[model samples]
Target: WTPPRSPFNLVQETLFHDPWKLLIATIFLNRTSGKMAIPVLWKFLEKYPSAEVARTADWRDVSELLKPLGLYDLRAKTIVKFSDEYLTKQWKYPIELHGIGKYGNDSYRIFCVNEWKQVHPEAHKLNKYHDWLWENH
Candidate 1:
């Protein structure tokens, strides 16, 4: 049977339990429509494969692969730099990356590690537009 897809659900299925992949996806997911980002996400996973591969990859190639999503320069460079730190095991939390914000942090904890309840107890509701989009569209 084919599984139905929700953006968060798809993320959980694909990148769950892998912190590196989760962070990468969370970064890209910000301001990106899930329908638009998810397919390209799979492509990115195939092409980049690992932090080792992405850390040394040509930015031009990475940027090209990300062209469809816009902000190619920002996302490509961020992922590359992220890969370098991640591969070296030097990555730490409270990261201050360009596109990451509160939602990104919460999403990372919730989907990647299942720690959102402990980490963000005060976060309790989605915005009206996003909630409506999720349910009705």
Candidate 2:
């Protein structure tokens, strides 16, 4: 089954191909919906590529990166917290925002991304992704 909106088109190249940006995208996409996320996520990574780059950002700057997405506070804190954890374990920034972290790739990142997505409508595959919940029901 499919929804009127397609997740395939929503998943950006930078996000789909890169692990860390994908994680960031997952975080930003939370709270409301990815329908609300596409442009904001696109613009955000344009300025801040990795958790370290994001780590240097104060909450005000982080809030700015997230304002356009709505649920501004939720996104900002999640992004910042995720960044602080990622940065404390590394050096410089993860260039290209390349990373081993991804919702589908590792248990920690995977759970983090999936849990956040779970709270929002966009996370569903078919309308929860394409309605597996309904189909199964």
Candidate 3:
């Protein structure tokens, strides 16, 4: 069987290429559908611009910007904490981050890590997700 891809992965290069940016984007994506998250993610990038700004921005304000995305409060906290912790100590692995989890970590590895396929071949394919997307769409 062929492995799946995420329909959202169409923008994989633009979406997951930058480690720091992808980390933040993945946090925002939780519990929200990709269609909704994509536009909001772009808006968010325009506002915060960098990890330093995201880490320092008041959660109240962040929550507001995230309102349309739903789960604004938790997502805000997730991104803030993720950014703060990431900026504080440079961890070698994104999987170490609190909210990143397997999906986000795999995404980071697939897009950002060099030689990731050789390191973990199974992680390279997200075909099931792509199949789901195809059927649904």
Which candidate number would show the highest lDDT if scored against the true structure?
A: 3
lDDT of 1 at 125: 29
Between candidates 1 and 3, the one scoring higher on TM-score is: 3
> Of the pair 1 and 2, which is ahead by lDDT?
1
Superior by lDDT: candidate 1 or candidate 3: 3
lDDT of each: 0.64, 0.53, 0.69
lDDT per residue as tens, model 1, 33-103: 77788789889989887778988988788999888898888888888877776666543452554445576
Runs of candidate 2 exceeding 4 Å displacement: 1-7, 10-14, 90-122, 126-137
The local distance difference test score of model 3 is 0.69
C-alpha TM-scores of all predictions: 0.70, 0.57, 0.76
Residue 107 lDDT in model 2? 19
Which 10 consecutive positions of candidate 1 have the poorest summed lDDT? 121-130
Error of 1 at 87 (Å): 2.3
Query: Cα lDDT for residue 24, model 3?
Result: 77
lDDT of 3 at 119: 34
Q: In angstroms, give how far residue 127 of model 3 lies from its true place.
A: 3.6
Q: List the residue pairs that clash in candidate 1.
A: none
